[PDB]
Design a protein around this ligand. Structure first.
Ligand SMILES: [Mg+2]
Ligand SMILES: [Mg+2]
Ligand SMILES: [Mg+2]
Ligand SMILES: [Mg+2]
Ligand SMILES: [Mg+2]
Ligand SMILES: [Mg+2]
Ligand SMILES: [Mg+2]
Ligand SMILES: [Mg+2]
Ligand SMILES: [Mg+2]
Ligand SMILES: [Mg+2]
Ligand SMILES: [Mg+2]
Ligand SMILES: [Mg+2]
Ligand SMILES: [Mg+2]
Ligand SMILES: [Mg+2]
Ligand SMILES: [Mg+2]
Ligand SMILES: [Mg+2]
Ligand SMILES: [Mg+2]
Ligand SMILES: [Mg+2]
Ligand SMILES: [Mg+2]
Ligand SMILES: [Mg+2]
Ligand SMILES: [Mg+2]
Ligand SMILES: [Mg+2]
Ligand SMILES: [Mg+2]
Lengths: 128, 187, 53, 124, 147, 225, 52
RNA sequence: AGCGUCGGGCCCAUACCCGGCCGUCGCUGGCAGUCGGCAGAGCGAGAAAGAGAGUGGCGCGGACGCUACGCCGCGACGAGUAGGAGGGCCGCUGCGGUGAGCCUUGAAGCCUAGGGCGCGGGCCCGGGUGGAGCCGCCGCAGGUGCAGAU
RNA sequence: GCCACGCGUCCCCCGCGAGCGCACGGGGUCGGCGGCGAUGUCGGCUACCCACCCGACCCGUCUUGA
RNA sequence: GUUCAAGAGGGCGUGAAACCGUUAAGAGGUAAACGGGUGGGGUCCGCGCAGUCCGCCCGGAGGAUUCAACCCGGCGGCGCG
C-alpha cells in the first residue's frame, strides 16, 4: 500500500536536459554551472543555428505541478519530531523528508510516530 | 509581427504605499473596500491621496481653512484634509469648526476646542458619513516649497525669474559680467 | 484609549493582596515597529570600537 | 487590538517556520497550522483548540472564556471527551454550533478530531 | 547598505557602467573649475552669470555686530504677550493700552507689514518705519522711542 | 412571511420571460422582411437592363458604395507616409482585413498605397462568412467573441441595432451608422491563402495581385478563409 | 567637469590633510578625569566654596 | 536537365491561422457575504433607480475558501549591444533575537556511472571517507561571487 | 402556406395552468474491453559508453568590418 | 607486534584538481570536441514482480453490563431579567 496522493496528474516536463555552459567540454577550469556570456562577437548570445540554447522564461512549468515528485507529494525538510504534527493535517499531499545530520536512534522514533500518523516518509531505511 | 511601440504601456502611478506603518495600511484596507463597493468618486480621491509622499500631502494652514469655510453655502460642513493642520499665529479670531485630519498639533487643537469645535478621525468619519456628504475637500499648496523658484527657464536667459544656486549672496558673488549693462552685457 | 482598568497586586509569596492599582496611560499608547527597529539599529552602532589597518 | 497585532506578528514571529517554498506555524491552538489571520489562535476573544489528551488516550477540547484576556491562568478551559467517534462528533458539533461560537472553524476541528482518534487507535 | 547599492548587480557586466568607447578615464575634461573662461564658458553663462568681474567698494575691517538689526513685523507683534493681556484690555472700559518692550525680546526695528486689530497699544521701540507708525495712529496709541 | 414575496418574485420572472419572447418574435420579423428586400434589389437591376436593350440604349449601373481591403505584405521597411495611412485603416498585421466606405477621400489614400493592398467590391455571401465565422467585437477595449445578441444590445441599442442581421443590413446598405458599426468590429484576422498567390509584387493587370481586382476578391476570400 | 547645475564651490582638500586628523575617542575618559579631579579638589578644600 | 511564351499540380521558413503552456502589462477588474431554529442561501441583465415601512378601502443538519504585501477572472503583447531600473526561498563572512534546533549511536570539509527539485543562480536526500563542532528563520554591517590583465 | 385563433370594450372600412421526455445546445466521457508476470523479467527522463542522420569555423577585445 | 585507528611510522591530521600507472568496459581510416532527435548496451535503484482503499448502504454471522429520556453535581456560553 503505497501512500496515494490526492491527485496523480500528468507531469509533463518541457525540457529535461541541463543547460551546460559554452566550452565546459573543452576545459576543466570551466564548470557546468550556467553563466550568460556578455561578449560582442559571441555566437551563442545571438542564436546561431545548431548552437547551445539559452534559457528563456518560456520553459516555465505548469503551476499545478511545480516542485512535484512523481508520486505526487511535495517535500518538507525535517529535523525532529515536533515538526511532524504540523503535517498531520496536511497529510495526503505532503511528506516529511529527514535531514542528513539527524541520527539513527532518533530516526527510529521519527518513523514510528510518522507511521502512526500515516505520513509517508521518503527515507525510512537510511542507516541500519 | 505588429508595428506598435511598447514604450509607454507601463503606467507609473502608485498602487500601494511604500510605508510599512500599520495605521496607514489599515486606512487603506478600509477605503479599498468602500472604493470598490460604492459609486462615490470621493473615496477614490481620498485613496489616491493616501498613497502620496510628504511633499504631495502638504500642511494646511488654519487661516486658509477658515476662510474657505467662510465662503457662502458651505456652512456647518466638515472640512477634509489629508495633510497636517498647523496653527496660525497671525490670526486672532477663531470661529468654531468641524475638522478632520491625520495629525493636528496641540496648539491648533487647543485653539479649536476652547472655541467649541470638534476633531474627527477617519474611523469616526466612516461611521458618520460613509459616502461623505456635507464635506469640503481641501489641500495645501504643492508649489509652496522654496525649490520651485529654482526651476524653469534658466538664469542668464531673457526673462527667467529663477533663483540660482549660490553659496552666499553679497556684492561680489554673481553680480557682474552677465547682469550689469556696463560690464559686458545683460540680458 | 480612554479606558483605564484596575490591576490587582500580588504578594511576593504569590497570593493576591487586597490592594488594586490603576493602569497608567502609556500602556495604551501606539505601537510602531518601524521606529523601534530604526532606533535600535542606530543606537546600537555607537557602542563600537574602531578597527583599521 | 487584534488586526493590529496581526499585522505585527504575521512576519516576525518565532513560531513561524518557512521553508521549501512553504510556510507553516506551530502554535498550540492552530488547526491547519497555516499563517493566517483567520486561524491564528492567540489573537481572538473566542478561540478553539482540539488536542489529544494529556494521557495518551483521549481528546480534550479547549475553549477560551471571554472575561479575563490579560489573565492567562483563568482564560482557557480544557475538557476531555473519552467516548466513541460518532458521539464525539455529535457533541462537538453541538458545542460549537448552538452557541454561535466560532462557526468558521467547524469543519477543520472535526477533521482534526477524527485524525487524532485515528492515531490513538492502533497503527496499520 | 552596500547590498542595496548598484555595484552588486553590475558584477559581471564588463565595463561596470562607464561605457566602452569612452572609458572611465581619469580626468577627461581637465580638473576642477577649469576652462571657465574658455571651453566651459557656457555652463557658467547659462547657470552662473556673474562669476567673473569686480564690483563695488572695498570695506576692510568689517564687524557684523555693529549692524545687528533684526526686524519684526506688526503681523506678529501681539505674539509677544500672553492672551489675558489682550483679553483684559477689551474688558478695560477705561481704554489703557499695555506697553510692549520689544528690545527685551531681542528685536529692534518695527516694520509695518500686516493688519492690526482694533485695540490701542504703546510700543517702546528703537526705530520705526513710516508705514508702521501711521497704522498705529489710526488704531490708537503712540510710538514711544528708546535708544 | 416569504409567501407574498415568493409569489411576487414569480411574477417578476414571468414578466421577464414574456419580454424575452417578445424580443425574439421581433427579431424574426425583421429578418424575413430583409429577405424580401434583398430579392427585390437583385431582380430590378436586371429588369433595367432588359428594358434598356429593348429600347437600344445602355444601362450604366451605380458606382459601388463599399470596398473590402486586404494588406498583403509585411512590416519591414515601409515608407512613413504609408505607415501613417496604414495604421489609420487599422491594418497592423499582415493578412488583416477591413471594410471601408467609399468616397474621394478614402480612394485617394488607397491609391497612395496601391502596391501593398488588394481591394474590391465584395459580395453578400462573403460578408456573411466573414461576420459569422470570425466576428469579434471591441467591448471595453477587449476582443470578445460575437456569440450572443446581448453583447450587441448593451452597446448599440441606441441605434436599434440588436442583432447580426441588422449589422449586415447596415454594411451592405451603407446606412447612417457605419462609423459605429465598423469601429465596433475588430480588424479581421484572416489566414494565409489556400491554393497560393500568383505573384505578390506586381499589379493585377501586369499579372499580379495588388490593386483593384473588383470582383475576384471573392475568389480570393474563399481561398483564404 | 560640471554637468548642468550645482553650487560652485572651493573645497580645501589639496594640502596633505589625511596626516593631521584629530580623533575624539578620548572624550568620555576625559570627562571622567575632569570629574574626578573636581571631586578631589572639593574634598581637599572642604568648607570653602567649590566654585571659587 | 538549354532559350522564349504559358497551364494545371506540387515542395518549406522561427512569417500567417486554430489549440495547449510560462511571464508581464492593461481592465487603477471582482472577493470582508463563512449575514445559519434572531436561517431561507439570488442582484450577468439591452434600456436612471427599492427582494423598502405602514395605513384608509417528528428528525437539530448545510464541502472548499480570505498569508488581502493574499486568492481569483478577463483581453492584448514577449529580438535586443553600449545604458538604466525592479525582484531574487541566488550564493559568501561575521553581530542581536529566536528554534526546550542537530551532533562521538560520529560535525565541518571531501569523493561519487545513485535518486530528485528549480526557467536559472543553486539546493535537498542515499552511499563511501573523515574525527568536533554546525545550521534554519527575522533584522544589521561588509576587505562579499574570476578565465582572460605579455 | 402563415411564428394567424377567448369574451367585452378601444381604432379605419366591410402580470402566478400545470406535467413529462429529446438534444448538432454556456471546453470528454464510457454505467466498454484484452495480454502479461517471483529468478529472469518490467519500469528507470537525467547521469555512463558506443553507433547513426542532420545541424556546426576558438574564445576575450578594439573595430564601419573578426 | 603497539594503539579504537598506523586507512597517522619522525617535513608523520584531513589529503581535491592538473599529471601518471595498472585494472575493468566500450570503440576506432576523413584530428579531436559539440547541439537536437532516437536506438543499443552497461550501471545501479525501484527492497516492483498477481496489485486502490475510503465513507455510506444492503445482507448474513459474533460480542459487551451499552442507547435515549429524567434526577443530582460542577462548568462554560447568552440574556429584548
Ligand atoms: Mg572577436
Ligand atoms: Mg513580437
Ligand atoms: Mg547589458
Ligand atoms: Mg575596456
Ligand atoms: Mg571619473
Ligand atoms: Mg568624455
Ligand atoms: Mg496543397
Ligand atoms: Mg545633477
Ligand atoms: Mg574642575
Ligand atoms: Mg517552425
Ligand atoms: Mg493564438
Ligand atoms: Mg525591444
Ligand atoms: Mg526582451
Ligand atoms: Mg579519519
Ligand atoms: Mg580530528
Ligand atoms: Mg583561476
Ligand atoms: Mg581587444
Ligand atoms: Mg564593430
Ligand atoms: Mg581599420
Ligand atoms: Mg611537502
Ligand atoms: Mg597525511
Ligand atoms: Mg571533477
Ligand atoms: Mg582491457
Amino acid at each position: 500500500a503505497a501512500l496515494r496522493p490526492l491527485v496523480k496528474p500528468k507531469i509533463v516536463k518541457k525540457r529535461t536536459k541541463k543547460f551546460i555552459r559554452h566550452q565546459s567540454d573543452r576545459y576543466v577550469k570551466i564548470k557546468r554551472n550556467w553563466r550568460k556570456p556578455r561578449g560582442i562577437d559571441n555566437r551563442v548570445r545571438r542564436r546561431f543555428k545548431g548552437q547551445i540554447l539559452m534559457p528563456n522564461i518560456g520553459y516555465g512549468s505548469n503551476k499545478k505541478t511545480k516542485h512535484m515528485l512523481p508520486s505526487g507529494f511535495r517535500k518538507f525538510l525535517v529535523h525532529n519530531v515536533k515538526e511532524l504534527e504540523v503535517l498531520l493535517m496536511c497529510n495526503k499531499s505532503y511528506c516529511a523528508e529527514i535531514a542528513h545530520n539527524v541520527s539513527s536512534k532518533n530516526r527510529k522514533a521519527i518513523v514510528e510516530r510518522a507511521a502512526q500518523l500515516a505520513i509517508r516518509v521518503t527515507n525510512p531505511n537510511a542507516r541500519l | 509581427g505588429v508595428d506598435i511601440r511598447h514604450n509607454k504601456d507601463r503606467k507609473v502611478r502608485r498602487k500601494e504605499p511604500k510605508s510599512q506603518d500599520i495605521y496607514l495600511r489599515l486606512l487603506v484596507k478600509l477605503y479599498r473596500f468602500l472604493a470598490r463597493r460604492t459609486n462615490s468618486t470621493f473615496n477614490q480621491v481620498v485613496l489616491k491621496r493616501l498613497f502620496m509622499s510628504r511633499t504631495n500631502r502638504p500642511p494646511l494652514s488654519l487661516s486658509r481653512m477658515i476662510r474657505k469655510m467662510k465662503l457662502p453655502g458651505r456652512e456647518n460642513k466638515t472640512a477634509v484634509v489629508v495633510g497636517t493642520v498647523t496653527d496660525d499665529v497671525r490670526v486672532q479670531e477663531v470661529p468654531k469648526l468641524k475638522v478632520c485630519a491625520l495629525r493636528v498639533t496641540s496648539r491648533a487643537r487647543s485653539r479649536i476646542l476652547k472655541a467649541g469645535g470638534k476633531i474627527l478621525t477617519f474611523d469616526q468619519l466612516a461611521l458618520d458619513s460613509p459616502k461623505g456628504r456635507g464635506t469640503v475637500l481641501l489641500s495645501g499648496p504643492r508649489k509652496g516649497r522654496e525649490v520651485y523658484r529654482h526651476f524653469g527657464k534658466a538664469p542668464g536667459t531673457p526673462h527667467s525669474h529663477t533663483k540660482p544656486y549660490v553659496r552666499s549672496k553679497g556684492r561680489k558673488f554673481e553680480r557682474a559680467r552677465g547682469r550689469r549693462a556696463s560690464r559686458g552685457y545683460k540680458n | 484609549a480612554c479606558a483605564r482598568p484596575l490591576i490587582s497586586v500580588y504578594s511576593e509569596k504569590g497570593e493576591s493582596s487586597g490592594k488594586n492599582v490603576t493602569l497608567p496611560a502609556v500602556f495604551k499608547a501606539p505601537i510602531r515597529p518601524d521606529i523601534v527597529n530604526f532606533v535600535h539599529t542606530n543606537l546600537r552602532k555607537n557602542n563600537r570600537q574602531p578597527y583599521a589597518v | 487590538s487584534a488586526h493590529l497585532q496581526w499585522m505585527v506578528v504575521r512576519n516576525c514571529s518565532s513560531f513561524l517556520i518557512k521553508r521549501n517554498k512553504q510556510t507553516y506555524s506551530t502554535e498550540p491552538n492552530n488547526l491547519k497550522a497555516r499563517n493566517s489571520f483567520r486561524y491564528n489562535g492567540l489573537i481572538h476573544r473566542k478561540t478553539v483548540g482540539v488536542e489529544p489528551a494529556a494521557d495518551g488516550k483521549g481528546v480534550v477540547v479547549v475553549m477560551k472564556r471571554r472575561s479575563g484576556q490579560r489573565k492567562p491562568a483563568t482564560s482557557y478551559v480544557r475538557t476531555t471527551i473519552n467516548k466513541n467517534a460518532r458521539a464525539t462528533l455529535s457533541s462537538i458539533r453541538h458545542m460549537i454550533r448552538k452557541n454561535k461560537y466560532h462557526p468558521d472553524l467547524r469543519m477543520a476541528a472535526i477533521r482534526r478530531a477524527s485524525a487524532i482518534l485515528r492515531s490513538q487507535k492502533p497503527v496499520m | 547598505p552596500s547590498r542595496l547599492r548598484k555595484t552588486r548587480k553590475l558584477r559581471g557586466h564588463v565595463s561596470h557602467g562607464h561605457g566602452r568607447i569612452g572609458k572611465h578615464r581619469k580626468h577627461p575634461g581637465g580638473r576642477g573649475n577649469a576652462g571657465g573662461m574658455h571651453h566651459h564658458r557656457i555652463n557658467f553663462d547659462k547657470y552662473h552669470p556673474g562669476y567673473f568681474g569686480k564690483v563695488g567698494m572695498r570695506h576692510y575691517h568689517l564687524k557684523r555686530n555693529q549692524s545687528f538689526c533684526p526686524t519684526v513685523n506688526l503681523d506678529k507683534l501681539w505674539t509677544l504677550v500672553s492672551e489675558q493681556t489682550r483679553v483684559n484690555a477689551a474688558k478695560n472700559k477705561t481704554g489703557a493700552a499695555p506697553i510692549i518692550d520689544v528690545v527685551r525680546s531681542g528685536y529692534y526695528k518695527v516694520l509695518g507689514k500686516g493688519k492690526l486689530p482694533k485695540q490701542p497699544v504703546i510700543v517702546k521701540a528703537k526705530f520705526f518705519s513710516r508705514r508702521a507708525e501711521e497704522k498705529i495712529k489710526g488704531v490708537g496709541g503712540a510710538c514711544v522711542l528708546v535708544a | 412571511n416569504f409567501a407574498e414575496l415568493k409569489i411576487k418574485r414569480l411574477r417578476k420572472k414571468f414578466a421577464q420571460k414574456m419580454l424575452r419572447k417578445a424580443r425574439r418574435k421581433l427579431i424574426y420579423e425583421k429578418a424575413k422582411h430583409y429577405h424580401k428586400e434583398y430579392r427585390q434589389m437583385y431582380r430590378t437591376e436586371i429588369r433595367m437592363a432588359r428594358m434598356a436593350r429593348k429600347a437600344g440604349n445602355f444601362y450604366v449601373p451605380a458606382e459601388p458604395k463599399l470596398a473590402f481591403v486586404i494588406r498583403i505584405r509585411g512590416i519591414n521597411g515601409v515608407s512613413p507616409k504609408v505607415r501613417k495611412v496604414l495604421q489609420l485603416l487599422r491594418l497592423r498585421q499582415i493578412f488583416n482585413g477591413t471594410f471601408v466606405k467609399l468616397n474621394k477621400a478614402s480612394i485617394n489614400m488607397l491609391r497612395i498605397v496601391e502596391p501593398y493592398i488588394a481591394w474590391g467590391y465584395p459580395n453578400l455571401k462573403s460578408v456573411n462568412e466573414l461576420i459569422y465565422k470570425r466576428g469579434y467585437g471591441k467591448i471595453n477595449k477587449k476582443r470578445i467573441a460575437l456569440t450572443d445578441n446581448t453583447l450587441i444590445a448593451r452597446s448599440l441599442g441606441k441605434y436599434n441595432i440588436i442583432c447580426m442581421e441588422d449589422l449586415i443590413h447596415e454594411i451592405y446598405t451603407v446606412g447612417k451608422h457605419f462609423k459605429e458599426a465598423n469601429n465596433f468590429l475588430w480588424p479581421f484576422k484572416l489566414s494565409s491563402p489556400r491554393g497560393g498567390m500568383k505573384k505578390k509584387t506586381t499589379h493585377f493587370v501586369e499579372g499580379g495581385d495588388a490593386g483593384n481586382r473588383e470582383d475576384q476578391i471573392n475568389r480570393l476570400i474563399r481561398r483564404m478563409n | 567637469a560640471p554637468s548642468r547645475n550645482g553650487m560652485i564651490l572651493k573645497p580645501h582638500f589639496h594640502k596633505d590633510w589625511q596626516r593631521r586628523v584629530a580623533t575624539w575617542f578620548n572624550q568620555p575618559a576625559r570627562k571622567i578625569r575632569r570629574r574626578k579631579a573636581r571631586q578631589a579638589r572639593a574634598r581637599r578644600i572642604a568648607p570653602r566654596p567649590a566654585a571659587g
